[PDB]
Ligand binder design. Sequence first.
Ligand code: BEF
Ligand SMILES: [Mn+2]
Length: 128
Amino acid sequence: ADKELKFLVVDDESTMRRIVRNLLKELGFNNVEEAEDGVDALNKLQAGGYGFVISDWMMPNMDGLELLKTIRADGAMSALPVLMVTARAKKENIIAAAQAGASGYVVKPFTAATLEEKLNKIFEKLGM
Ligand code: BEF
Ligand SMILES: [Mn+2]
């Protein structure tokens, strides 16, 4: 994928956003911004320019399932790639997110290899 792709990394834990941003940097992506919840994320997204979202689920203000649904319903954002990266592990959770339009789903804790693999899986699917 284009190394100028602009990422939005969303999680209410600074430590997890830091993991994800440093992983992206290793993969060659430096155009990366952070958001602390679904509302914060939508503000950044409405500001424009974003090509990929990586999002947690459990967050105050607006959770990641609601954030995914909001993105998928919005005509200006509807095809935006959204990778869920979450501790939510039940099959029912994966189903709700997949059916809501998740591009991919990674369960915490995850390895560097898993993130790279699942990001590349989305790039291939979308022809990026
Ligand atoms: F708080 Be997240 F869904 F890992
Ligand atoms: Mn969380």
